[PDB]
Design a protein around this ligand. Structure first.
Ligand SMILES: N=C(N)c1cc(-c2ccccc2)c(CNC(=O)Cc2ccc3cc[nH]c3c2)s1
Ligand SMILES: N=C(N)c1cc(-c2ccccc2)c(CNC(=O)Cc2ccc3cc[nH]c3c2)s1
Ligand SMILES: [Cl-]
Ligand SMILES: [Cl-]
Ligand SMILES: [Mg+2]
Ligand SMILES: [Mg+2]
Ligand SMILES: [Mg+2]
Ligand SMILES: [Mg+2]
Lengths: 5, 230, 230, 5
């Protein structure tokens, strides 16, 4: 997945 | 600007309508106009500001990443570069617009720790977004501006806020991602995410059911990144 | 306008990039500029035009419906009406912009049935979108303009196209929805959807595997509306 | 559902 911010 | 003739309350009201309508560019223009009225912003109004520009810049970044990937594949006519430059320039304009609001004059008027930490996190976020696309003579300075804003926010939050505060947690999340993918410090990113998660866990017992859900929602995002990175 | 200095091919190329980037407002501006070059559009270019404005106007309509619902609930300050008017005016501008392109001069230069039916369907679609928000002295005329464009497209498609043609089917789908929710002719809407579905079924046997999938994809949308309405 | 076009 795409890292989270 | 073009919102100078509308009441502050009317601008806040319409920013909430635009949010419900998923018109985030309208939402941003309304909150820009509200900020330019010159009054400090309430906690809710600060979130309306952040949400609006997050979504606007979020679409631009996603578009930039698609075009940038196409461009690099083409480097394994000028139209791909030109259009990526166009999106990029527009993205940088929004980033400069937010930084202008923080600097004129939300940050210097923010005396409370909750409000000051909120704006300095935003400052780091939008120097980081500029950093995602920077390539030239002042990339390093953009990166350092993000680091410095993030670092001051972390020092204030540590002193003045409990480890479970959602803004402190969101700040830690984003400073960790800055370390990982902007500063090429993946081990700093992992330590910060772990230490933030653990110190919030040790503080959950002091919280109400509602605050408990707010904090753990963001602790899970820290956990997700830790899981991705290790 | 602002695309007059870019090559036609470059505008088409960037419209495809903007589609991949989900930048449909950029996509529309590029295809607008391509149309204004004055050359007829190929089948692919016609679809790029339709897709771009469909998505732009699709977001505006969805936003209009949210705000309109809020407005009516409030009628069971002026800000709700004002912002709904703003979105509405912007939506009408896009509709007028497309109708201007069809009228200057895509329709009169479209001699083929495939291209002429395509543009007249678009004409009906965008008079219908104007009708969705019309309330005053010329609502009836807007509705009749949609009907007339749809009706000419149906007459040409019937004469000149097979019953499974995807454009003929999409036209029938939209003319049926016009009848149902714009013209208050729900029984006309149901008859047209049924007759269109049946005559396409009887023609599927002449088709290739690829054309079969194109046609049945749209026959299912006719079936979905029939299921919703009966 | 919402009718389809
Ligand atoms: N209109 C809006 N979007 C909001 C209005 C208010 C608000 C504020 C004060 C009074 C009334 C409403 C919001 C409050 N959000 C927070 O405090 C921080 C938080 C917490 C959890 C998560 C998970 C992902 N991100 C998160 C951010 S958001
Ligand atoms: N860039 C794009 N979006 C497209 C490029 C081309 C294209 C055309 C010619 C040559 C190359 C590409 C497209 C072709 N679509 C159709 O013919 C009609 C159709 C068929 C099925 C459905 C289901 C919902 N709607 C539908 C519409 S769409
Ligand atoms: Cl460009
Ligand atoms: Cl307004
Ligand atoms: Mg006032
Ligand atoms: Mg190690
Ligand atoms: Mg040329
Ligand atoms: Mg009956």
């Amino acid at each position: 997945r795409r890292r989270q911010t | 600007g073009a919102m100078g003739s509308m009441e502050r309350a009317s601008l806040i009201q319409k920013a909430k309508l635009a949010e419900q309508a998923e018109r985030y560019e309208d939402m941003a223009a309304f909150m820009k106009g509200a900020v330019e009225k010159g009054e400090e912003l309430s906690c809710e109004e600060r979130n309306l500001l952040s949400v609006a520009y997050k979504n606007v810049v979020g679409g631009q970044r996603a578009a930039w990443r698609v075009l940038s990937s196409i461009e690099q594949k083409s480097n394994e006519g000028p139209e791909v570069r030109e259009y990526r430059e166009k999106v990029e320039t527009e993205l940088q304009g929004v980033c400069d617009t937010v930084l202008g609001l923080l600097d004129s004059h939300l940050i210097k008027e923010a005396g409370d720790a909750e409000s000051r930490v909120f704006y300095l996190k935003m400052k780091g976020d939008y120097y980081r977004y500029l950093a995602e696309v920077a390539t030239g003579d002042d990339k390093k300075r953009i990166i350092d501006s993000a680091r410095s804003a993030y670092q001051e926010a972390m020092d204030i939050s540590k002193k003045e806020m409990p480890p479970t505060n959602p803004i402190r947690l969101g700040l830690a999340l984003n400073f960790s991602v800055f370390h990982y993918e902007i500063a090429n410090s993946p081990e700093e990113a992992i330590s910060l995410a772990k230490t933030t998660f653990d110190e919030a866990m040790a503080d959950l017992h002091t919280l109400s059911e509602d605050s408990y859900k707010d904090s753990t929602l963001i602790m899970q995002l820290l956990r997700d990144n830790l899981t991705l990175w290790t």
